[PDB]
Structures are given as C-alpha cells and as structure tokens.
Amino acid sequence: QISVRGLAGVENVTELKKNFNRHLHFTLVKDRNVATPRDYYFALAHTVRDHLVGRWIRTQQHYYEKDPKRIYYLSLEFYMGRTLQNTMVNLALENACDEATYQLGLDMEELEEIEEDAGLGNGGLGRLAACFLDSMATLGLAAYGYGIRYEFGIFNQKICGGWQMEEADDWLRYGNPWEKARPEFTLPVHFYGRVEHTSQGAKWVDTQVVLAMPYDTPVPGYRNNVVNTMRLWSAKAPNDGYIQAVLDRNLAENISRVLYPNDNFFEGKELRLKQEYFVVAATLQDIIRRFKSSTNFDAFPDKVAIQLNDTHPSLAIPELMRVLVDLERLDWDKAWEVTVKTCAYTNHTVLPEALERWPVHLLETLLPRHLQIIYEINQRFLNRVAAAFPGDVDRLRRMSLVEEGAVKRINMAHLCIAGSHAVNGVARIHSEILKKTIFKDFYELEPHKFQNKTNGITPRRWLVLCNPGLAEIIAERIGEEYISDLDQLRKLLSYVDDEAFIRDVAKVKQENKLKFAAYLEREYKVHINPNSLFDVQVKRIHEYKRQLLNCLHVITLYNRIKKEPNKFVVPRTVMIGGKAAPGYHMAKMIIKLITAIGDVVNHDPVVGDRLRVIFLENYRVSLAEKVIPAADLSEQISTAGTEASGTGNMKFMLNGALTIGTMDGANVEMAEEAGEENFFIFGMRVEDVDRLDQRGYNAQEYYDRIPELRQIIEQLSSGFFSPKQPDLFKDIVNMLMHHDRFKVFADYEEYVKCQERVSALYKNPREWTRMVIRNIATSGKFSSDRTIAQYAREIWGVEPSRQRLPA
Amino acid sequence: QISVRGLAGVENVTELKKNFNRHLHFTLVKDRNVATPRDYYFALAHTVRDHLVGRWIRTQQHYYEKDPKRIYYLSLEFYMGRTLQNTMVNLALENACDEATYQLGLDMEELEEIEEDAGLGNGGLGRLAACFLDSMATLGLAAYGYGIRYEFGIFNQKICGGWQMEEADDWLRYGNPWEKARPEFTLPVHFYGRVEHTSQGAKWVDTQVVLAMPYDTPVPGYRNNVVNTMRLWSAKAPNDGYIQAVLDRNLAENISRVLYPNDNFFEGKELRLKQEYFVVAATLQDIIRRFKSSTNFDAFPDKVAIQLNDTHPSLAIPELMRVLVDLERLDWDKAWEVTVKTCAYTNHTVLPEALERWPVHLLETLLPRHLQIIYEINQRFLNRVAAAFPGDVDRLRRMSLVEEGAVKRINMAHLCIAGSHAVNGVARIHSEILKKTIFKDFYELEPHKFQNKTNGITPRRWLVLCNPGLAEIIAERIGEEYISDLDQLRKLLSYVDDEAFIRDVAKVKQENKLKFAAYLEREYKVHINPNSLFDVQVKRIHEYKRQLLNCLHVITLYNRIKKEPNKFVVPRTVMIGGKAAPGYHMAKMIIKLITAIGDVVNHDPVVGDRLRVIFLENYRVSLAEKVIPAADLSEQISTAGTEASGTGNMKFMLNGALTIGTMDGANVEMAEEAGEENFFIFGMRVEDVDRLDQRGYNAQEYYDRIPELRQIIEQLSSGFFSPKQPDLFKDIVNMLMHHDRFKVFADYEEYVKCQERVSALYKNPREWTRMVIRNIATSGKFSSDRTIAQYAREIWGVEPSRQRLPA
Ligand SMILES: O=c1c(O)c(-c2ccc(O)c(O)c2)oc2cc(O)cc(O)c12
Ligand SMILES: O=c1c(O)c(-c2ccc(O)c(O)c2)oc2cc(O)cc(O)c12
C-alpha cells in the first residue's frame, strides 16, 4: 500500500492467513461465526509473534556462543505502549499482514485499537527505558531490560464533572500474548531477618522469602534479525488458621500488584522499598548465574554493565557487594572495585522532592545487612573525601550517604555516585546544572565520573509507526536509511524551497488533523474545528511544567476576543492532557480549572469555533501516537532549570510541529540544532531565575503592573469560572499570588507576546510549513540510537553495529 | 504395544511428532538443548489438546443446532485428577503418542508424572462429579459441569515427625494447558445491598459486585467424538487511598482462592456461603441466556435440568425464583412450578454434622432478597403440609425450612426437597435410610419424589487408564466393548476354571505390586516386601470410617506375633492413607497413631518383613490410580449406617482386590452382585447398631470381656507407642472408652476373626484368584455409565446414546 510498510509478498500473505486461521481455531477455540474483533486481534497477535521466535532463540543462543559484555538496564518502569504494530514494522510484515487481514475481510487498524497499552510507567523516565530497549536491539547490543511486571500499570484516568477519577489499569484481563512466563526460572528474594557474624563471614538469617517469577517479552531490532529480551519479575508466595494462611499469600504477592503513580516525587512507603529490593535482588542473581555459566570476578566488569535508571534500583550497589562479600567470599576491596566498575547511574531531575531518602529505621528493619554495608561504604567514601580535601568538614557532612536529623536517612543519590564509575544527566543544560549545584562536591572529587547523555526517542514508534504518511513523503526523496540513521534527515534542508515537498508536508499534517478530529468525535462526541491551529500541551500535570501558564494564556485569548469581538484572530483548538498523581491536590485542581475554562469558553456564542479548550482524557503512549502527529504547536513551557530534558518535545519536532518553549532541558539543544530563529523561545533563562531567587520572587509586583493579568486573577477569585462555587479556585490563586515556586507571573508577558508571533506565522501557511521543514530536517540528533551509541562507547565499553543476523 | 491402547498409525505418529516440535518451538519457545521434561510434558499436552478442538466446537455447535434438553451438573467440587492420559485414551491416541514420544527419545509415562492433579475436591462427592462428567459425555448427553476454579485445591499433605502438615496446592503454578479462559463471557454476581419494593416488583439494590470469569475445560466421551464442557468460575474485582483500593481488589478475588477442606462437615463461614452463591448466580445467568438464545418459560423445564450435588448449590432454588419473579416478571406460582420441575437434589450422608444450616442473620445481610424468597417458600410449603396432615403441628415444626433456637437457621436440605422434583440417595441402603429416618416426613408428603441412584465409577480412568494390564487380559477374551458396557464383565465367570486366565490375573496383580513397591522405594526410600498381602485402607480420615478399628487389628497382629514368634502368619504390608481436615483434632491424632504403630512395628527384629505398617502420604486421585491396582485386600469398615455409598470400594472391586467390609452403603450391593460368599462381610448390621443405641453403648463391657483388646488399650495408655510422651494418645483412649459414636469395640472381635479368614484364603493362591475373578466379573453394575443412564431416564427425562459424531 505505502512503501516504508514493506512487501505484501504472495506466499507471505498466504502463509499469514492460514496461520491466522490456525490460531483462531486451535489457540482461541473459535470459528468465524462467533469470533469477535478481539479474537481476531489475538489470532493476529499470535501469528505475528511466531515470526520472532526463530530470531529470538538464535539471538540469545548467539550471546551464549560469542560471550559479549552484557548490558543490564535496570528500571522500575518500562512504558512500552502497544506491541503489535511495532513488531510488524520491525520485522517488515506490516503490509503483508494488512493485505492478509484485508483478504480475510478484516481492517487491521481496527484490530490494533484492541490492544491494551503495557502502561508500566509514569512518563518520561519510563518511556526512555522503552525507547532505549528498542535502540539497543537495533544497534546490536546484548542488552536486557529488567523490571517488575505490575499487575496494574499507571491508572486509567476518567474525567467526571471535570475532575480526575482513577481506576485500576487492568491490562492483563484478556491475557498478554507478547510475554512468555518462565516459572521454571523462579528465584528467591529475602526480606527482614537479622545479621549473624560467624567466620566465615556475615550471614543474613531468619528472613521471610518472596519468590520472583520472570516473564520474558521479546524486543525486536529494526530489520536486523536481533531479538533481545525484556524480563519482568512477578511476585509469588513461597511453597511453604489454614484458610487465612492461604489468603495471606496475597501480602507477599502485593509486591508486584501496582505501579506507584508518582511522577518526579518521593513517597517513603515500605511497599515501594520492597518493590525496589525485589527487582534488584532477583535481577542480580540472574546476572551472576549467567556470568558463571560461560567464580573469579576480576573479569565481571568486562562482562557486565548494570545501568541504574534513577536511584530506584540503587540497592543494586549494596546488593552486589553483599553477594560478592558474604556469598562469594571476596575481600571487601576487590568487591568494591568490581561494583564501581560494573555500575553507572542516570539522574533525571534536580527537584529536591524527587530525591530518595529512606529512613534508616526502615532499612534497618527490612534490609539489615544492606544498611551495614551502606555504613561501611559511607565510611570508606568519606575517608576518601577527607584525604582529598583535608579539614573540610562541611564538605564531609554534605557528601555523606547519611543525613542527620529528627529522622536519620540514607541519601540514595549519594550512594549511586559513590558506587558508580559514571553518573550522567539527560541533556546538556541539566548535566551542567548538576555539576554547578547539587552534585558539585562530587564533581570536585571525581570529575571524570560526570557525563552528559542527551535523551532521544525512537524514530520507529515515534515516526514510522505513528506517522506513516510523513515517513512516506520523506522516504520518497531520501530512501529508507534515515529510519535507523536519523541524521540523514538533514538532507531535507535541500527541499526547503521545493514546492512539491512544501505541499506534501502541509497535506500530511492536514490528514493527521482530520483523522484526530474524527477520533475525538467518534470516541467522545466532541466537535473540533479542523482549520484551527492545534495547540497542544501533553505531559504529566505538575507545577514545574506550568500548565497554569497555558491556562493564563488561554483565558487571555478569550478576554481579548470579548473586548474586541470583530478583530480577526487565528482560530485555535487548545488541547491539554495528562495525569495527576492521586495525592497531589494542586495537580488535580489544575485539571479542574482547564475543564472549567472549557465550560465557559466552549459555550460562548461570540467565540464560537474561533477558540476551543479541551482536556484530553487518559493521556498514555497510544494516545500520544495519535495526537502528536496532528499537532501544530508544541507547548514546552517549563520554568528554566526544572525540566531535565523532556522527550515529548522531541516527538513533536519529529512529527511536524513547531515548538513554543523556554530555554530548558533539551529545548536548548533542539533550538541549537534547528537555529533559534526556527523556534518560539521565550521567558527567563536559568540565570534570570537565579537573579529573581536572589532578590525574592514577589508575584504581587506582576499583578500590579499587568492589567490583563489582574483581570484573569479577579475572574478566578470572584467565581467567573465556577459560578456555583465562587471560591472553588482560591487555592490556585493563593499559590500564584504567594507561594509560586515556578514563577508563573514572571514569564506571562513574554509568553503572551511570543504566542502572538506564533499566530502571525500561522497566517502565512507557506512560511509556517518551511519553518516546519527546517525543524524536521534537524531532529536527527534526538534519535535514541544516537543516545544509546553514546552510552555504549562512553559508559558501557561496547561497540554498536548495524549488521543483520541470519534470516 | 498393547491393543486396548489403540493404533500407532505411521501418519498419525509422524504428525504428532512434528506438532510436538512445533509447540516446543513456537508455544514454549525452547529448543531441544535447554528443554526440561516439564517442557516436553507441555509440548505433548498442547499437541494432544489440538486433537479435541475439532470435536469440541462441533459438539457445542451441534447442541445449538438440535436444541436438546441441557443437563447442568452443579457442584462445589470437581475432583478431576490428571487429564493427559485420560484424553489420549478417550481419543484413541495413547499408543500413537507413546510411539511418537519414543521416536523422539522420550518416555511418555515419565512425562505424565509431571502433570498436577486438578484436586478441586475433597473425596467421594467431588470424584463422583468427575466420573459423572466422563459418563455423560460417553452417553452422548448435552451436559455441562459448573463449578469454581479454586486457585488452590485440596491441600498437599506432608508428614513431619509422623504428623500431618498442610501446604498450599499451587496447581496452576506452571499453567493449565487444558482450560481455555473466556474473559469475554464474564458476568456480574451481587452481594449485600437491601431490598426495595416498587411496582413493578421487588428490587435488589446497593449491592457490591463481584465478576465471575469462566474457564472452559474439555470433557471427551469414550471414542464417540463427543466433547462436552466443564465450566469453572473465577472471581474478579469490578472494573470500578489509591494504592490500598487497588490492593483491596484481593478481598473480592478471595472468593475463588481456596477449596474448603472439610469432607462431610459443615462450617458456617461467610466466605463459604459466598462461594456457594457465586457459583449459583453465575451459572444460572449462563443457563438462562443459553435458553433464550434458541422469554416464555413454560418450556424451561423441558430444556433445562439442574442437578444439585448436595446442598452446596441449594441457593439455585431461590436464585431461579428471584430471576423469574423479579427480573422476568413471572407470577410466583408459575415461577415455582418451573423451579421445582427444573431442579433435583442428591444427598450424600445422613450424619447431622454435615447438614448445612445457615444463620438467618448471615443470609439476611449477605442475601436479603434470597432470605425473603426462602420465607415465602417455607410458608407455601408448610401450607401444603397442613392441608395434607391437618392438625399435625409437630410435623410442621420438624419440616420447616426454618429452625428455631438461640440462633434461627435455614435448613438447606429442607429447602432442596421443597424446591426439587426428585431427591435421591447414592446407594440402596442409604436411600431407604433417608425414607425411614431424616426425610421420613418429606417421604410421607411426596413419596414419588424419592429415588435411589447407586453410585458408580468410570471404567475408563478406573480400569483402562490405571490398570492397562488387567484391561488387556480381559480384552483378549471378550473384546473391548466392556469398556463402555461394563455389564459384559459377567462373561468372565465362564473363565473361573480357565487355567490361563487364573494365571494371567495373578500375574497382572503381581506386576502392579512390583511396580507400586518400586514407586515407594524410588520416591520415598521405604522398603516393602512384595510377597506380602497388600492390605489397604485409603479414604479421608474420619471416625465413621474407622481407621482406628484397622489400627486395633494391626496391633493385634503384632502382639500375636510377639506372643508366638514361631507360628507362621501370612505376611502383610498394611497401608493406610488419607487427609484429615486441618481443624479436626481427632483425625490428626489418628494419623499420628498410625505412624507411631509403624515406628514400633517396622523396627522390631522379631517381626522383620512379616508385618509392615505404612502411612501413604498425600492420598489424591493420581495416587489412587497407583495403589488401588496393587491391592490385595480392600478395607471398607465403616459403622453400619454411616457410609452413604462409598466409591473407593468399587475401584478396588474393579481392579482385583477382595473386600473386607460391613454391610454399609454400596458394599451391600457389591456383595449381592458377586454373592456374599465372595466377600469378607463382618460386624453389626444397621439393625444391630440401632439395638445397641436403644440399650446404650458401653465400651467398658467389651474391654472387660476381651483380653487382647484390653492389652492394646493398656499399651496405648501407658505409652508403648509413644515412649517419650506416654500420655500422647489419652484423647484417643478416652474417646474409645467413653464417647465412641461409631462403636469401634463392638465390631472388634468379628473383625479380627474375619481377618483370619482373609489370611486363610491368601494361603491358597489359586482359590484367592478364583474369588477375585468372581468379583471382577460382577463389578459391571458399578459403572458410572449405568448410574448416569438412570439419572437421565428417571430424573432428567433424556435418552442416552452410544452413536459417534462425524470424525
Ligand atoms: O484518530 C485515530 C483513530 O480514530 C484510530 C481508530 C480508532 C478506533 C478504531 O476502531 C479505528 O478503526 C481507528 O486510529 C488512529 C491511529 C493513528 O495513528 C492516528 C489517529 O489519529 C487515529
Ligand atoms: O509405581 C508407579 C511409578 O513409580 C510411576 C512413575 C513415577 C515417576 C516416574 O518418573 C515414572 O517414570 C513412573 O508410575 C506409575 C503408574 C501407575 O499407573 C502405577 C504405578 O504403580 C506407578
């Protein structure tokens, strides 16, 4: 049908069809008279998964045979999304399956909508894990993803009366055809107990046991026959009155029941700590077994890299030490050398509320041996700080793994830096901020530890998959190589005055917009004007991301229209979407304000279809693949210094939106790649935020000097956006006026003015589209292949590769 | 290899082999270098299940097409055992798979030992359900089994220090290849709430919802291409702080977590009541849907029979009424007519402690609408009793569904009789006892309600499967027809003086004994003498079954040997096995006494291999298939009047053991079938037990008059069988001396004397074996095909059939 989708070979189609029917009859036990589309999806899913197994067994067999260094990507979150399309695309079976399902009288796309997201993540950090597994398989690395198989992923969000309601994300209800259960490789994990010193060694005794049962999911590289593994652990009660004892097996099985729904926020809950130890202990036994199956650990860092995605599996460090010292009888010093050289740590935020700082009492109880090891680590590490900086005792107290206070805590970031050979941030500004501020003392001690690794996104899911029309028009001019060599998109600059390309680019955007508008009307009965500018902010709801600043802009547009009804303005559909953490009262109030603004704006007959505001419900990876290709303006308006990188930013750039943003995170590099003249950059830079902090931020000043701002705040206080409950938003108002950590009012004027520049350009379609070309053509750096190649060469010590395995 | 096992066709073998390899590669994702026997079992299991699906879909499709009356067998227990061998035998694929697995270098029998029992039952009543599904499919009935899919079946029993220890029967750990999940046919069940009377009707509102998810298992008939369904419901929380709310989904899912482990004993636990309503509500919605999918219910009893296996799903009666009256708007009278004609009830014991008698307060809370309906039922039913027996008010209070007392209760048996058109016992003596005693008032009101249906066992599992050697020697003389026409075994009487048959019968027994002895030594390192008489009592541990009486006999044999060491006695290996309910202190003490007797007996050098006592651990359906074909003497020694039927009795008769027993349950019919002269019948008859009850049972009398008995009791009291804990068995002694409901001492002398007759015969091998022939040849009545044909003609109103469906 379209070329980037591959060949619908005649044998291939004929084979797929009968394999479809075979699974429908034997696997599903259905005939065509009773089968639902759901059965059809599953038949197709089984059929497609059979095409991997040959490669899946050979890839793993090949790593047994050639013994390369193995990379273990350890994360509490893998935000995988759907798997069916992605698997077809990476195996080159998309047109063949589309034709085969067509010949059976089925619409493949309709079938794809049946698959549940594997929503085992919150947002950026979990999706990065997902993009990384893709890129590592595409670059031929012997890489494993290790995580938890949550029974319930990130909650499904409903909006009732304009408010978020959470419900269980029961993603496994109808089964998961992609995973293979491996109960035969189940492993014991220990909790509680107490420590005995004998000789030989310390001994961790009287523990409770939880079993960890692995489930393996395949991870296919792009057209290279590589199929790596994502292994996720599931919690199981041990083998060994009566009814209550059987029922009490749930307590241990609750360890993998549900993903904690906090994006960038630390809650010190014991269950969360258990989940972190559970993934770390099970994983490290796997790693060690595999290493032995090729008891002298000199070579262990040449054969193993363990990458820590945030501090969440930071326990890997004292766990590896525990195994090496207590079970393998290595001297401490050798063990530590091995540990540091095996581990590396990635930081994803500088915001203090995200820092993991576990109470010492809690670790003492749940993991007594690990606390002792942490103390010994801290002593030797601070001994090093003393030798390097004699007499600097404040530096000692600041660098310590132990925080003194009402409650003594362990700082997990400090543990990670001490126990890792490399520490990285996720965009250049962020990595520099780390060296200047929170990790400055650690930087001065060990400067060659500290690196940058700018994030990326996979151009498979985030272009070929979600926007096949754009991928096609690009392939038509430059071939298909850019798909795994995204720097080739720079060749599109030579088309910035090509009339046919300019036309094709606009036509593809317009098709994405028409299609997205159809989705909304079909699945939610909401009418959007398809000739409006699609203005979109999609990401988790937080104060630092400044959805409220968007809110102030939206209401400004409304009040401007009402003051001068007859003045032309570019129509917009302003879309905001994302989940709030269940406990974050402020976040929930903001979602409510967005829907409340909609209640006025969308029913004002003077405004009509010139301005609509909609809250996109249940933002998740599959909804991202729909709305991002339809977008005109990408809102990326975080307070300078707060967004470590962002990745949603990159998706929009890749898919033909222009960006309005602050110089924060990877926005800085994106503007550098495209030319600043091709970005709507506004607001304080980091330096200016600091100057404001030095002086004191006083919101009242901005209110007193900006009449349009004053009018919005008064509308909020007096009840204009909540007539029945006039004080409904007093908490938002008070925060804005007196406790705004993110300085919303200080960027208001520059933001509104920059938004005027956006509209001005949109009035000139031709020049809008030429600027878009200049963005797409410079998005190549933001491929996760680039990012992962940098991890492999600069941290892991492995060489990536583009060569096929046998067919 | 052997003929009854079927043809190893060359194409068939070639096809099985590649399907084996296909599943190993695609389903299991394994190659032959890493595969465990466990993987091989699963590959074989998937391969074998593919051979059913053609027939499975056509059978169900055929019942849609011909609309016969459907039979719904409703039970809280389906004691299915293993499925792999049974499926091969019923499809005629046993030799073909054996040859195919042989050609792959695999031992099929070894593979079969990997499969877990589906142990979703306690004992007799659950196995009967299992045998019935087999026989109904073999007789061509459109029959469904409806039950609960317990996550944990009957507990696995370990014996530590001679004591029972229970652990979770985690039967689903490695998956179940036989079932197909049907989450798409999930259904809501309601609990709690309260009743509103509007008009139209009563309304049950404010309920909590539990979802019921069906899993379908195939049930293949013997070589007739019929494949019926066993549907088992599994509990699921409804779709709709946050973490605790997700975790609290377990409370509702606990409904199907674990089988209650009480054999013949009522515990009034709310969770058990919930399980009973859950199976009944889900099942009845299925039934009604299916009936509508062919809203006038005149024909509903012509299209539906619901059979109640004990009172456990007795709620079916007020549930069917609730649906018909409240949801379908039928007048009460018509609804009741439909209900009585749809339902029938099977009783399995007369022991009062087994009677379900639920507190009115509990039903009021959990099932308010059902309590009201029960009250209305009771009123109209007692109105009938008054018209038939004017002025007999004691009869009214005795017959009432409501028991008055400190706690008001509902008598579920009384509900069943009132709401059913047929009530049956499970052996002729038992059915007569019901009419004479506990149900006498109900018999006088409605005599044509009351029937007998003598139990049976399936000759597939219980002969062809478990004892292929015996089945072969029988087939060699009479052909294979007896396999589904077990009355043909009477032709074996003409061989009672055939020298070759006498030899073959003894040779087969001897092979079963050698093999069982090998099992015990391999899997437990216990040495048994294979030229000893294998004396076996296997069944649940209860006082009424009188394992203690066996205990007294065993110790008598020991004391006799010690008193006269040089006198010849026939060597025996005395085997006792079975589970005690976790809470039944007495039952647990008895298991302990058996092992304690072993501790003395088996280490006395004067006894040596002349007498051994072993406690067979973890008696379950698969262990029954091993030990029953190896047995010489079948112990069936319950107090006359207490064992409603028994079915273990029948297994032993079928498999070439002779029986020592009381005239109780189906023992009476078995002796009638074979001739009493071919049974070791001893002890009080029912009549004699009654006379003893009239006079008062005084144990002391038997103790004072029987020196050998006195010596055993003194050995028990003084600590001979527990030197370290001399008073260990004082509770057993005291029960025997002062509270023995089952009158152990009263049958002691006759039992010991009858056991002397057994030994005397065993000394004459030829005449032992001729008596065995006379037993086997008269076991035909005890086929479950016979039983089910009687249910179909005399209760359900359907005609059984022996004809094939298309290939
Ligand atoms: O807008 C979209 C839409 O509605 C569907 C869809 C949903 C349900 C169905 O049953 C169906 O056939 C298609 O898919 C999409 C896929 C995209 O990549 C982008 C989109 O904008 C849509
Ligand atoms: O005694 C028996 C025995 O040991 C086995 C067995 C167990 C484990 C194995 O691995 C194996 O190959 C065979 O099966 C049996 C099957 C019967 O029907 C009867 C028996 O008496 C045995």
From Swiss-Prot, chains A, B:
- Membrane spanning stretches: none
Keyword Acetylation attributed:
yes
User: This protein's superkingdom?
Assistant: Eukaryota
Cellular compartments per GO CC: skeletal muscle myofibril
Q: What modifications does the entry list under PTM / processing? A: Phosphorylation of Ser-3 converts phosphorylase B (unphosphorylated) to phosphorylase A.
The Phosphoserine modification is found at: S3, S400, S484, S717, S718
Site label Can be labeled by an AMP analog, positions: Y144
On subunit structure and binding partners, the annotation says: Homodimer. Homotetramer; to form the enzymatically active phosphorylase A.
Q: What is this protein called?
A: Glycogen phosphorylase, muscle form
This protein's species is Oryctolagus cuniculus
Q: Its encoding gene is what?
A: PYGM
